[PDB]
Ligand binder design. Structure first.
Ligand SMILES: [Co+2]
Ligand SMILES: [Co+2]
Length: 355
């Protein structure tokens, strides 16, 4: 068909032949064309997930408004994402929980059950959500504001993310990408409520390579100078993300934890404790090595699971990822895209007409 008003038609039904739209293709800063075409089914899975991400976020920008609760915003977004990705166990679905981190919090907040937080006119909210097909993950994120006082801070971070995307390429050193991002970000000065700031990158947050069912595959993309001279390689996939702040430019763990994920390297572990065994089975069936949140356990009918969840964290089977925040009173912004380092070109697979 054509897509519906509030979106409800799965991306795979909009593109009947199984061939999905490319993202932005870029020259990097024969045999390789054969090598590129050999992985076409993989690129196509990323593109299906990226078109779902494009259509979901456009819909979100149409209705997100102060006065909504954070739970209402997350549930309305995730409902649409499940429909457009055509959720099907671990073959298609949500790759990680909807981040909606506010103000000084830069990442890894999503509400748990009972959270009464309401979105305000002066809030700066980072919407970070992920889709996948067959474990091929799109990690892409943007910042929502309603007061025009944050416009230059948003522009700084968007320009820095685009600079990291342009610098990236096969054989490029990851430390060079960081230096480049920081140079652009720090070229911006902003004025918010009568105080001026030079925008600083959050130095202990980073982009990351992506692997199959593995949001963090092991290499990190720094956003300040001073990092490793490890090179980017042909065939790798990266989330190029940057964060800018008016605070210290450093985040710490804060608030209640909502995001959790099985450690990718831990094998099978026999458990006899009944509630802990049941919860690990629930995680293995529904999430595998993809991240989840407490709201997603509640939705599956689980209750009284918090001690079993703590047990799995203390065993090192699951890791907790608490919200990461700069100092009180500071403002943080984020923009992110997923890029594929194909043999013939760099594709910014999650690029849209919006950002
Ligand atoms: Co992200
Ligand atoms: Co990311």
């Amino acid at each position: 068909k054509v897509q519906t008003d509030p979106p409800s038609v799965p991306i795979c039904d909009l593109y009947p032949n199984g061939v999905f739209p490319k993202g932005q293709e870029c020259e990097y800063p024969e045999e390789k064309k054969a090598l590129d075409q050999a992985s076409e089914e993989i690129w196509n899975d990323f593109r299906e997930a990226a078109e779902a991400h494009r259509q979901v976020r456009k819909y979100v920008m149409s209705w997100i408004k102060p006065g909504m609760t954070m739970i209402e915003i997350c549930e309305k977004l995730e409902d649409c994402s499940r429909k457009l990705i055509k959720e099907n166990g671990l073959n298609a679905g949500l790759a990680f929980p909807t981040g909606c981190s506010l103000n000084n919090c830069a990442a890894h907040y999503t509400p748990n059950a009972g959270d009464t937080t309401v979105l305000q006119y002066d809030d700066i909210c980072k919407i970070d959500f992920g889709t996948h097909i067959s474990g091929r993950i799109i990690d892409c994120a943007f910042t929502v504001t309603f007061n025009p006082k944050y416009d230059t801070l948003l522009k700084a971070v968007k320009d820095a993310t685009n600079t990291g995307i342009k610098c990236a390429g096969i054989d490029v050193r990851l430390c060079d990408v960081g230096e480049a991002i920081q140079e652009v970000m720090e070229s911006y000065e902003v004025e918010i409520d009568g105080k001026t700031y030079q925008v600083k990158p959050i130095r202990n947050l980073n982009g990351h390579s992506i692997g199959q069912y593995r949001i963090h595959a092991g290499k990190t993309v720094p956003i300040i100078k001073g990092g490793e001279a490890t090179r980017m390689e042909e065939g790798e996939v990266y989330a190029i993300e940057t964060f800018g702040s008016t605070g210290k430019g450093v985040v710490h763990d804060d608030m209640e934890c909502s995001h959790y994920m099985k450690n990718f390297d831990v094998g099978h572990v026999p458990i006899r404790l009944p509630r802990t065994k049941h919860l690990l089975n629930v995680i293995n069936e529904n999430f595998g090595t993809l991240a989840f949140c407490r709201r997603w356990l509640d939705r599956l009918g689980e209750s009284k699971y918090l001690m079993a969840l703590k047990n799995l964290c203390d065993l090192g089977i699951v890791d907790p990822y608490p919200p990461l925040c700069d100092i009180k009173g500071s403002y943080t912004a984020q923009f992110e895209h997923t890029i594929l380092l194909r043999p013939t070109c760099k594709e910014v697979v999650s690029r849209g007409d919006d950002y």
